[PDB]
Nucleic acid binder design. Structure first.
Ligand SMILES: [Mg+2]
Ligand SMILES: [Mg+2]
Ligand SMILES: [Mg+2]
Ligand SMILES: [Mg+2]
Ligand SMILES: [Mg+2]
Ligand SMILES: [Mg+2]
Ligand SMILES: [Mg+2]
Ligand SMILES: [Mg+2]
Ligand SMILES: [Mg+2]
Ligand SMILES: [Mg+2]
Ligand SMILES: [Mg+2]
Lengths: 95, 60, 144, 220, 25, 63
RNA sequence: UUCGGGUCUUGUAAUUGGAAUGAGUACAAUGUAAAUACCUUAACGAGGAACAACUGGAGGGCAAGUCUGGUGCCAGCAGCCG
RNA sequence: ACCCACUCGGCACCUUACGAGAAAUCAAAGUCUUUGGGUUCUGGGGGGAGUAUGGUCGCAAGGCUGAAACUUAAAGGAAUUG
RNA sequence: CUCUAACUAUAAAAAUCUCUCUUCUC
């Protein structure tokens, strides 16, 4: 059990819209945007991802539309987060 | 945690490096004197004849 | 043997043989086709200044892993648009979009270098002052 | 350095008896050499310079096993050259075996003149070539004092030869060192293997030393 | 890929573009 | 050999080299002047000749 | 025999003194159409002789570190391999 | 018609290196750094691509002629060991 | 130093596959 990672004014939590090739991903970000994110190294083939997950993503302060994955939540931490209210709860994802 | 700050800071490690200040630095002789001093260091004040010249040896 | 013309009065055929064979090596062909001016946004120029449009971060190639801070720029001398890398770590904050930047070559005669694809151009002077000077804080941008 | 050296290879026995003045009487009669103590005894001051220790690998069912090939050149800078390439698991053993091999394959050369012969000929006597793989090496004689114009490896080879001046030219992929050194060594060894026109006279074919001194060999 | 089939694709494209040009005239 | 251009220009070269004295007075042959071993031209520097004459005492002093 | 002469030579203090002069000044003249500038040359003019040599690099090509601190496939570096 | 022996010409074959090459191997792929018998035609890293266009021939399929922009540090040959 | 003989006969199906590649002088 690892502690979940909070946002520190420069990264935000997003929902994978679809899965794109070559390390890209489309992330519906909970800021009213459909951003594009990259597989940050140290995580490419060490932590797998996919459609219908919740990922912490760090935004590029100079280039807006593109951003990079940082940390993903394993079906436990994201539900906790929506319980506190760190994320808008209107996006419903349940298997 | 996984990242201390926000990635792509565009010059991050510059800001977090610990600054250090040049010490007193006695003036090394320059020009002809520099060449004389270096030649004296290498070939007439010979330090290691045990095979390798191994000059500027790491302190260990 | 050595099936090239070899008589004492065979200057023309052998010379034109060379004249047609030289069209194979790339440097000579590029030199005479004049493609260094129609192509190659640097109009045969070692340097050219341009105006910044935005600051895009280009992803590295496969074995390396990093996100190199490049910058788009529209040149003045011919109007064409191109990206350009920003060396010398602490200098993306020096870009200040909509400022003049003096681009040079990038070490590979108009070819992408190493792990930084889609770009072939360095950056040496911005706002008149040198990136090497800015990075080591010997001079400052007047900020016009 | 126990100089016991029980002499196998009858020639060596003669060398032990001190009945050979110099390796000339060997080379003149094309006498094969097998024991390195012979070349140690005759030429007293061999100097060696290992040129490269190349790692070499092979694939077995369990990982990669590695040896090292030492390419060491030996000589005395007075008209005697030799080359030894030898491989072993240990670097030191490899270089020692390469020293032995190079000492066995000592080759004498023909130092000639660029023109207007003077004391102590400086350059080669004839343009001479050699080949190994695609390394095709060429040596052209040099005017006195022009120095050795060659690649680092060939330059060291020429210095070990004693030739103070020779121009070189190599074609092919001289990136490899073993092929380049072997080809250059063959070329420098072919200097005698080329009929120089100042040698019309056919000599009376002096008796071989191990022929006239076959009695002292094979100590019963 | 096998160059036979790449050439076949290219010739299919040639046929399509030639038919388009013929319809244009 | 004996070519008048050879005989004149080479002899002038020898004359200059013995006037400067880098070449010895015995090796005047147009052949020895082909190998000089660059140290020799250094030996005729003003500081070097001063030190060999004295007055210098650790050449840098003279320098 | 505890030593220990230091028996044979090197440097380390980076402390202390006796000499010399340029770079800058500058009387004057020479120089020049007039001039500065150069060559001289009075008087000045060196102790940290602050009168302070930068520019690149230290895995290989390629001389030179497997010393220390920080970052932790991020920042970047890297002409090619990395 | 066979057998023998000799010769001229062709498809070839066997042994071999004393030559060749990177090697597979070649009696020509030799007589080549000891570079020179006469001659035509091809190629200059790999993709783009034998593609775009321009011709040119063809009823048609297409053939011949034939690049660049750009991208890349390899693609490839031969043999060796697993 | 003379020698030209013996033979058998199967093909069912079987797709896909993640990091991480680096060190030899005495
Ligand atoms: Mg990323
Ligand atoms: Mg100063
Ligand atoms: Mg520095
Ligand atoms: Mg450093
Ligand atoms: Mg080095
Ligand atoms: Mg460190
Ligand atoms: Mg650096
Ligand atoms: Mg090509
Ligand atoms: Mg193609
Ligand atoms: Mg057509
Ligand atoms: Mg193969």
């Amino acid at each position: 059990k690892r502690e979940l990672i909070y946002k520190e004014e420069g990264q935000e939590y997003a929902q994978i819209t679809k899965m794109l090739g070559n390390g890209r991903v489309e992330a519906s970000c909970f800021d009213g945007n459909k951003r594009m994110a990259h597989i940050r190294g140290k995580l490419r083939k060490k932590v797998w991802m996919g459609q219908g997950d919740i990922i912490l993503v760090s935004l590029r302060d100079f280039q807006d539309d593109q951003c990079d994955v940082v940390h993903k939540y394993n079906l436990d931490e994201a539900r906790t987060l929506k319980n506190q209210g760190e994320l808008p709860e209107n996006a419903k994802i349940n298997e | 945690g996984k990242v201390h700050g926000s990635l792509a800071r565009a010059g991050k490690v510059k800001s977090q490096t610990p600054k250090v200040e040049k010490q007193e630095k006695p003036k090394q002789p320059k020009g002809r004197a520099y060449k004389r001093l270096l030649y004296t260091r290498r070939f007439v004040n010979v330090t290691l004849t045990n095979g390798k010249r191994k000059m500027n040896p790491s302190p260990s | 043997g050595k099936g090239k013309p070899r008589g004492l009065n065979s200057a023309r055929k052998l010379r034109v043989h060379r004249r047609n064979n030289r069209w194979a090596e790339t440097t000579y062909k590029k030199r005479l086709l004049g493609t260094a001016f129609k192509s190659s946004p640097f109009g045969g120029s070692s340097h050219a200044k341009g105006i910044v449009l935005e600051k895009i971060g280009i992803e590295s190639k496969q074995p390396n892993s990093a996100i190199r801070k490049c910058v788009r720029v529209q040149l003045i001398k011919n109007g064409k648009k191109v990206t350009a890398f920003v060396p010398n770590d602490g200098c993306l904050n020096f870009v200040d979009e909509n400022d003049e930047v003096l681009l040079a070559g990038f070490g590979r005669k108009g070819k992408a270098k190493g792990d930084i694809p889609g770009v072939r151009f360095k950056v040496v002077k911005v706002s008149g002052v040198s990136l090497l000077a800015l990075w080591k804080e010997k001079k400052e941008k007047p900020r016009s | 350095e126990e100089k016991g050296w029980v002499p196998v290879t009858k020639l060596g026995r003669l060398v032990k008896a001190g009945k050979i003045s110099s390796i000339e009487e060997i080379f003149l009669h094309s006498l094969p050499v097998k024991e390195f103590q012979i070349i140690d005894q005759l030429l007293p001051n061999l100097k060696d310079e290992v040129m490269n220790i190349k790692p070499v690998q092979k694939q077995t069912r369990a990982g990669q096993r590695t040896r090292f090939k030492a390419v060491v050149v030996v000589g005395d800078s007075n008209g005697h050259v030799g080359l030894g390439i030898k491989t072993a698991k240990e670097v030191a053993g490899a270089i020692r075996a390469g020293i032995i091999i190079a000492k066995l394959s000592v080759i004498p050369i023909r130092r000639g003149y660029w023109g207007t012969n003077l004391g102590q000929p400086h350059s080669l006597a004839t343009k001479t070539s050699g080949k190994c793989g695609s390394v095709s090496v060429r040596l052209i004689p040099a005017p006195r004092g022009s120095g050795i114009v060659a690649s680092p490896a060939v330059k060291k080879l020429m210095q070990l030869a004693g030739v103070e001046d020779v121009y070189t030219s190599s074609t092919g992929s001289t990136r490899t060192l073993e092929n380049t050194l072997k080809a250059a060594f063959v070329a420098i060894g072919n200097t005698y293997g080329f009929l120089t026109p100042n040698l019309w006279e056919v000599q009376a074919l002096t008796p071989s030393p191990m022929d006239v001194y076959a009695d002292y060999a094979t100590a019963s | 890929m096998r160059a036979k089939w790449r050439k076949k694709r290219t010739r299919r494209l040639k046929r399509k573009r030639r038919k388009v040009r013929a319809r244009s005239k | 050999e004996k070519d008048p251009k050879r005989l004149f220009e080479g002899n002038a070269l020898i004359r200059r080299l013995v006037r400067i004295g880098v070449l010895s007075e015995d090796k005047k042959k147009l052949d020895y002047v082909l190998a000089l071993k660059v140290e020799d031209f250094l030996e005729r520097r003003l500081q070097t000749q001063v030190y060999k004459l004295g007055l210098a005492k650790s050449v840098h002093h003279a320098r």
